[PDB]
């Protein structure tokens, strides 16, 4: 467990001090879980059930990224640079 | 945002009243329906949601409704825009069509007069 | 948090009994475990024979390790001729 | 892993090779090399006593430590190297006291791994112990038959034997062949499968590559003449045309068992392959 990743990408674009539901925070946590799960699948190549989990996370993260991009174009660009995404 | 099915379903089982999530046009439909004699009153409450108040349409105050056999149909997401000239009449009278206008609604005379056919109901 | 129960072969002197138990405690502690409790159930009649041993000395240990320790317990417990059974259960 | 070449010529079609992924250096330890001339299958009389051996690439011998007799001194795996003299790869061990030796590279072994020999060693891949010290079910390789002589059995790429049981002076061992056999419990063995397990999958691809490995063409008996082989002669092609297929020296060569009846080792062979 890491609230580290919360308090980092809360404060970058914080609505509240104890913001949790910011797209920033969500996308960041998704990015952390995605990347963790990828390295599981490097080892456990034929864990297909878990891999469907990955594809759902990826789809959530994409949809939240498309949401920012349409909402706040600058705020989107700051998030993808810090996480190191492309889209 | 379909009050009509909510009405139909309750009307079928001769319900006394029903609580429909309120919206401006669903409010403005219920009053068009009330022109006959449904709704007695509603209870506007402290707004948390934008429609928690509901419409509280009460067409069955007594055991049996004097106005029974309520029926609607023409509500598709494919948009059906009526000409002021060619506004239909439900059952050749004995039924109304809520023709959404910029300024007007209801009968055939309230089309060439009022103008925008817009939405069309039954 | 893990409980490690293990049976020792009954043909064991109390000197060599301690020698086994102290070695397998050192397997845990040296590999980054903290033994947070022990227990001795003593000699018991086994429900079924194993390795021609009708009875055996049961031996519980509780640890708060991170896996690698209690993994290293197993591979040594399997190798050893003195431990006749063992389990590792995660605690609730 | 096996690297498949693309069919850029008829020679290359079907040919596959090791990727040599495990190999960590290209240069052997000079102090552990010895000269090795080819022999052409010719004995001390100068006569050809084994057929189909001849030519191939020049090779230096790497002196392998099959004995594993630096007991108690730990050794660090410094390299994994190609050895042209055998199917397995070899590992240069740097011993703590500055002695360097080569061993057979077991499956798994990594540069930096510590290895250890002797009766008070762990059952880790690359260690070597007297068989009396190795638990039942342990996969082993480089098994001695005589104490101190050095490992003779189960040395080729990917091979392995399992320890089955202990009879005091003897230990039962299932050999790679599947033969179960008694081995003196004082005989050492090395822990693990021999590496380079993919060796058998190599498709040699072309005639010339066999020639690089010192194999000369095999001529079938049935295209020789009667003075050369029992299958020789006949007009046109001929079937074997004999009670049994025969060797070039007139023994039956299909099913005929050649282990010496009254072998001394028969008492130690529990189950034949």
């Amino acid at each position: 467990i890491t609230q580290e990743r919360k308090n980092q990408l809360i404060n970058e674009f914080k609505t509240h001090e104890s913001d949790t539901g910011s797209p920033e925070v969500q996308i960041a946590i998704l990015t952390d879980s995605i990347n963790n799960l990828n390295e599981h699948l490097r080892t456990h190549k034929k864990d297909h059930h878990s891999r469907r989990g990955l594809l759902k996370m990826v789809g959530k993260r994409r949809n939240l990224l498309t949401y920012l991009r349409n909402k706040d174009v600058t705020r989107y660009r700051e998030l993808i640079n810090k996480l190191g995404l492309r889209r | 945002a379909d009050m009509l099915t909510r009405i139909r379903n309750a009307n079928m089982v001769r319900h006394e009243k029903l609580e429909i999530p309120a919206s401006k046009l669903k409010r403005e439909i219920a009053e068009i329906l009330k022109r006959e004699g449904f709704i007695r009153d509603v209870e506007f409450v402290e707004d948390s949601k934008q429609g928690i108040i509901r419409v509280f349409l009460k067409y069955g105050q007594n055991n049996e409704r004097v106005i029974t056999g309520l029926k609607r149909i023409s509500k598709p997401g494919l948009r059906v825009y009526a000409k002021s000239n060619e506004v239909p009449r439900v059952l050749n009278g004995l039924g109304i069509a809520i023709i959404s206008t910029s300024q007007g609604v209801l009968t055939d005379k309230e089309a060439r007069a009022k103008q925008a056919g817009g939405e069309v109901l039954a | 948090k893990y409980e490690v129960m293990y049976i020792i072969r009954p043909n064991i002197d109390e000197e060599s009994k301690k020698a086994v138990i102290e070695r397998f405690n050192n397997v845990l502690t040296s590999n980054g475990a903290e033994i947070t409790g022990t227990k001795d159930w003593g000699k018991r009649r086994l429900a079924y024979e194993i390795n021609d041993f009708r009875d055996g000395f049961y031996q519980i240990v509780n640890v708060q390790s991170d896996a690698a320790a209690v993994q290293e317990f197993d591979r040594l417990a399997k190798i050893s001729d003195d431990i006749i059974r063992h389990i590792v259960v995660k605690e609730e | 892993a096996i690297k498949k070449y693309k069919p850029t010529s008829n020679g290359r079609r079907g040919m596959t090779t090791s990727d040599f992924a495990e190999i960590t250096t290209d240069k052997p330890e000079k102090s552990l090399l010895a000269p090795l001339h080819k022999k052409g299958g010719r004995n001390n009389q100068g006569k050809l006593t084994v057929r189909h051996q001849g030519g191939g690439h020049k090779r230096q011998y790497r002196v392998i430590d099959f004995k594993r007799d630096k007991d108690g001194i730990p050794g660090r795996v410094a390299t994994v190297e190609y050895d042209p003299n055998r199917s397995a790869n070899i590992a240069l061990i740097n011993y703590a006291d500055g002695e360097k030796r080569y061993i057979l590279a077991p499956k798994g072994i990594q540069v930096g791994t510590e290895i250890m020999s002797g009766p008070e060693a762990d059952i880790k891949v690359g260690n070597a112990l007297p068989l009396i010290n190795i638990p039942v079910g342990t996969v082993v390789h480089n098994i001695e038959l005589k104490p101190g002589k050095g490992g003779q059995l189960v040395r080729s790429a990917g091979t392995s034997a399992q320890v089955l049981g202990k009879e005091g002076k003897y230990v039962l061992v299932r050999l790679n062949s599947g033969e179960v056999r008694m081995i003196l419990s004082a005989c050492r063995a090395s822990i693990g499968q021999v590496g380079n397990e993919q060796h058998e999958l190599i498709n040699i691809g072309k005639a010339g590559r066999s020639r690089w490995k010192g194999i000369r063409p095999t001529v079938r008996g049935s295209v020789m003449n009667p003075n050369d082989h029992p299958h020789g002669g006949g007009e046109g092609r001929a079937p074997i045309g004999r009670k049994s297929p025969m060797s070039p020296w007139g023994k039956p060569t299909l099913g005929f068992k050649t282990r010496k009846k009254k072998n001394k080792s028969d008492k130690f062979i529990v189950r034949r392959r």
């Binding site: - | - | 429900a47 079924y48 389990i87 609730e92 | -």
Partner: protein, 65 residues
């Protein structure tokens, strides 16, 4: 019927607690049904696990008479 675990207020069944597990096996050693014992579904799962761990390390028998 009444559940032994729900009634007595037991929220955790040790595999090592032998005397308890002997109440929920036959003479032969077979795990007793919910119909006979009257235990809850959740505890019957927890119990079964405990039986099977016990059998692994010879606390209880697989088969015996």
């Amino acid at each position: 019927k009444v559940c032994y675990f729900t009634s007595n207020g037991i929220t955790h069944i040790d595999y090592k607690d032998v005397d308890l597990l002997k109440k929920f096996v036959s003479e032969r050693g077979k795990i007793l049904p919910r119909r006979v014992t009257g235990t809850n579904a959740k505890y019957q799962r927890k119990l079964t696990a405990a039986i099977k761990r016990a059998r692994q390390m010879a606390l209880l028998p697989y088969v015996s008479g």
